[model samples]
Structures are given as C-alpha cells and as structure tokens.
Target: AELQDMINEVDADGNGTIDFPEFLTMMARKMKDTDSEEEIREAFRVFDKDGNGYISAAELRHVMTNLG
Candidate 1:
C-alpha cells in the first residue's frame, strides 16, 4: 500500500481533508525521511499549542481562529 492506502485512512468516509502538503510531509515521515521535519514541525506544533500532542480545544481553537 502506497499513497492509495494512506488516502483511505486520511480521507476515508469523507471525514476530513488533509492538505496536499500535509500528505507529502506525512508520507515523507513514513518513508524514513527527516528532510521535511523542519517544515511540518512548526505547522503541527501550532495545533498542539502545548507539548502534549495531537489536537483539540486549542487545536480546535486554532481551527476556529481560521474558520470561525
């Protein structure tokens, strides 16, 4: 399974969409590459807001700040 398999979990059931750049970054991470980490790191950190991880609330707040 390459991009297709990832696409299923990423956008399956039409739940949500992952930006094209995000798709590349995630795939790069999975492919054992660190060159893109510097890029995605900052963007992903914006969602976490804290050192915890994942997203919601502040993560969600960032969402609201964008689309609210």
Candidate 2:
C-alpha cells in the first residue's frame, strides 16, 4: 500500500517509470518519514551504481529485492 502510493507519486512524466532523481526523492521522503536517512542513503548508494545520474528499472528492482 505504501509502495503503491510512492510509485504513483514518483512515476514522473506519467510514464509508469521512475528515473533516479524521482526515485531518490521518493525514497528520501519515505526515509525522512521513518527517521532513517542514514540507512536509506547507504541503500541508495548501492542502487546508484557506476555513480551515474540515472537508475534503470533493472537496477532499482535489483536493489529493492536484493537489499535487506
């Protein structure tokens, strides 16, 4: 339910997909709400592999399912 709401909010451009910034913002908001930015940042860094500015669906999904 919470994930669904975030997906709805972050699917910017209304394209049913989330880019890095959008995903990051949504994550930050969520972490902020939960008081867990420290943990969230580490997870985010993993997803932002190659230090690139954007995150593909594959990367996002991998991190989501792989990370604790």
Candidate 3:
C-alpha cells in the first residue's frame, strides 16, 4: 500500500510520467532506512516549498541545492 501510494504521489500530473524531480522526492521519502511518517512530511514540506500541494521544478531545485 505504501509503495502504491508513493507511485501515485510521484505521478502527480496523472500523465504516468515520473520525471527526475518527482522521482527524487519519492526516493527521498522511501530510500531512508528509518524515516518516520513525520520525517517524510517534513521532507515534503521542504521540497514542496510553495505549499501548493505539489512539488514543482522550482521547489526541486531547492532540494538539489541542499543536496549539493
């Protein structure tokens, strides 16, 4: 269920195309060994900077900046 939910979140546009930025967000949420739901929510907040209920390219760059 968690896996499917992640896929749906990544396919936000509903066009079935998960780009790099989208994949990054999903990976960040799932790639961790011990990330709680709260941690994931915070990460979502960080990546979805505008709080527009979606993660955009601009927000993605912010994530990349932190990563770099």
Candidate 4:
C-alpha cells in the first residue's frame, strides 16, 4: 500500500510523527529548505517525462510505478 513512503513523506524531520508545519505544508516544499531551485527543477523534469512543462496523473503513475 506504500504505507512506508506515505509516512516518510510527512515525516520530513524523521521525528516519527507529523508536526504542525508538516500538516500545513503537506510536506510539499521541504526540499526547498536545503536544496536549490535547480535541483527541484531537475526532479520535476523526471516526472515531466513528456517535456510538456506540466505534470499529470498519468505521467505521475508512469514514474512512480518504477520505484527506486
């Protein structure tokens, strides 16, 4: 069910729990805390495989299906 990944997505600080900010931010921009914008852009490129400059549900599943 991808339960492990789900919790990890929320547990950015690895404190074994979801803090207030985690809930507010939905853990979406945590990478910006330390990573560069270029890094995020490149990561988005991986998901935007079609190079259409937008991500869709169909595209997301295509990348996620092949887990690291």
Candidate 5:
C-alpha cells in the first residue's frame, strides 16, 4: 500500500517520467521527518547532476546503489 502510493507519487507528471523536481519533492517531503530543508536541498543537488531540473535513472541508480 505504502509502496504503491510511493510509486504513484514518484510518477508525479503522470506521464511515466520521474523527473528531478518530482523526485526532489518526494525526497524532500520524505526527508522532512529528520532532514532539514538545507539537508534535503543538498541531497537533491547531489543526485540532480547537471542541475537540469531532472533526474535520470542512471543518476538515481548510481547514488542509491552506492549507498551504505
């Protein structure tokens, strides 16, 4: 149920594209539980390579795959 909701939220544009802003908003809201706005922003930047306002699956996979 929760995972399904996450899947829907991630696909924010409803076009099957999970761009950076969509992903950022999801992460920001999720992180708000413990991370400050600055922290979330910084984290977003880290994954938002190129700063083009979109996150590719490669970028996301890279960061998440490397996470300890």
Candidate 6:
C-alpha cells in the first residue's frame, strides 16, 4: 500500500505510468526523506566508501551485516 502510494505520487502529468525521470525523482525524494539533507548525504558518503557517488552491492551488504 505504501509502495502504491509512492508510485501514485511519482506518477506525474496524471499519467498511469512512471517514466525514468519520474522514477529517479521518486528515488531521490525517498533518499532525502524527512531527515536533513546533510544527514542523508553523510550516510551515503559513509556507505559509498570509494567516493564514487554510488554504493555497490558489496558495500550495501557490508553495511547491512554490520547493522545487526
């Protein structure tokens, strides 16, 4: 239900489909969330150890494993 709501919110132009840009926008919005942008950026920077501006599958798995 929450996913559906997000999909609907991202469905701009009143279209039934979500385009690539809309999807990207939705994801970016989700990433920022209710927290401050600096907090989100800091977390992303921590996870993206390579400083490549993106996290790899290995990095994600490592972080998740450390979370528990």
Which of the two candidates, 3 or 6, achieves a greater TM-score against the reference?
Answer: 3
Candidate 4 local lDDT, 1-68, one digit each (tens): 55456555546567644433443344355443534556545545565447354333344454668433
Instruction: Please write out the lDDT profile of model 5 over residues 1-68, one tens digit for every residue.
Output: 13345445467677543554665566676573544656555655566445444444444544666431
Name the lDDT value of residue 50 in candidate 1.
59
Off by over 4 Å in 5: 1-9, 14-32, 51-56, 66-68
TM-scores of all models? 0.30, 0.34, 0.42, 0.40, 0.42, 0.37
State each model's CA lDDT, in order.
0.46, 0.53, 0.53, 0.48, 0.52, 0.46
Order of models, best TM-score first: 5, 3, 4, 6, 2, 1
Between candidates 2 and 5, the TM-score winner: 5
Residues 1-68, model 6: lDDT tens digits: 13345435546755533333443455576573444556545555565445344433344444546430
lDDT of 6 at 39: 57
The lowest-lDDT stretch of 10 consecutive residues in candidate 4 is: 16-25
Per-residue lDDT of model 1, residues 2-50, tens digit only: 3344345555234343443554555565694544645655555555445
- Which candidate achieves the best lDDT against the true structure? 2
lDDT (tens digit, per residue) of candidate 3 on 1-68: 13345445557567443444554556676684534656555565667656444454455555656431
Residue pairs clashing in model 5 are: 20-54, 20-55
Model 3 lDDT-worst window of ten: 1-10
Give candidate 1's total backbone clashes.
0
lDDT of 6: 0.46
Q: State candidate 2's TM-score.
A: 0.34
How many residue pairs of model 6 clash at the backbone? 0
Each prediction's number of clashing residue pairs:
0, 0, 0, 0, 2, 0
Q: Which residue pairs in candidate 4 collide?
A: none
Supply candidate 2's per-residue lDDT for 28.
73
